[PDB]
Symmetry: D2
Subunit: 57 residues, 4 copies
């Protein structure tokens, strides 16, 4: 798990004070973060690079 | 605030590509993209008139 | 099959960066990502039990 | 406009024959495609490239 659920909840509250987070949202968000990192790695590999940069995200 | 655990991101990267190193600013860029995903999810829920984020809003 | 007009993609790129050129493979990759965005929007609508795509599904 | 709305409609039908498309969906999809291309351009610029590749998408 790459996410801190309490910090996701706190961030959501900072955007919309009335917005709550379902337990299944955290799981779906975690899967999307994994997908972002896997895509970043594929961009770096396509370049022949062994370093991930901001521009690969 | 910061939603990601950088050590867990590093561990995940290693699980995909053992030889891949991570430039420090990648963690910050990944954090910004996760914030962007959550802000978009909030806009989807608000457009529906919901006060709860569901998996389908992501 | 193709949702994009390649000449219009090229024109848009030039409007953002006049010096930026477009490889043929970029158009194909962009087309695949647009299909992926629409498939994601369809899954959001289906999860909600809607039979219409709205702006908020994108 | 980069998208052909009739082709978007045809693609939606190919995925889900019962799914209808609101007029506002086409406009929202067009805005998201502009955002994808702007992000791709920023990735290429960050790399110091003057050509867009598949890996920039």
């Amino acid at each position: 798990e790459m996410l801190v659920k309490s910090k996701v909840k706190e961030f959501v509250k900072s955007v919309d004070p009335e917005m709550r987070v379902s337990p299944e949202f955290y799981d779906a968000l975690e899967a999307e973060v994994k997908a972002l990192v896997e895509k970043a790695i594929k961009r770096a590999q396509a370049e022949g690079r062994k370093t991930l940069y901001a521009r690969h995200v």
